[PDB]
């Protein structure tokens with residue numbers, strides 16, 4: 001029995017190493033990672049890898065690892081796949097904890113945009129969770145936190161984190177994590193997976209996939225939103241991704257909206273994440 005070494009970047013930025021039999025399916029590796037993390041509420045999470053383009057791909061738990069990574073290194077990341085719309089309803093604090101770590105990276109990366117005040121408030125709850133009660137002894141008027149809070153740090157943002165941290169005295173890690181999530185869940189890009197595409201006229205749009213449905217970002221105005229119930233059918237052909245939308249009441253025939261993706265793999269990736277998110281919606 002020949003086994004392949006796997007390396008997984010965890011959400012704290014540490015590396016987990018294990019071996020699986022070389023013909024193992026994704027689920028085998030994912031189960032080992034989740035046992036390592038003491039994670040029971042595993043359905044919200046997954047593993048990603050980077051292809052030659054260094055584009056992120058979900059490791060399909062049902063398929064052989066070798067037929068996915070193909071020529072690439074057995075190097076993965078552990079990530080939230082399905083962002084819970086209501087994190088208070090998760091059964092375990094440790095689940096909310098990993099979700100916070102993911103969202104912290106979502107924020108620092110700029111995938112999840114955030115006002116100055118929300119950056120500072122989220123940051124204050126992270127500090128309360130990580131270090132406990134505000135201590136003047138560690139924080140001078142010149143203090144800069146080890147914690148990454150934002151895509152671009154300023155002294156103003158560090159000061160506001162400290163100001164808000166002072167107000168959280170006596171808050172436990174689980175409580176601070178729950179407040180963090182109550183705020184983060186409201187942000188317009190929470191749990192939105194964005195894909196580059198062109199509309200049928202060749203105009204650059206972004207397609208967002210999330211729990212509630214599909215978003216077509218055409219410009220700062222004209223954001224079209226199709227709740228999952230409004231989406232009849234989706235499919236990809238060559239570089240094209242198509243969504244069929246239910247007609248309005250007493251209208252004949254659904255509408256088709258077509259999109260051009262960069263290449264066939266990008267169309268297939270978008271199709272698969274939409275199918276997977278739509279099933280998630282069907283279970284809610």
Ligand SMILES: Fc1ccccc1NCc1cc[nH]n1
Nearest residue numbers: 212213214215225226227228
């Ligand atoms: F309702 C949706 C449908 C499809 C994709 C996303 C959403 N987000 C919630 C919302 C409702 C109104 N504006 N934002």
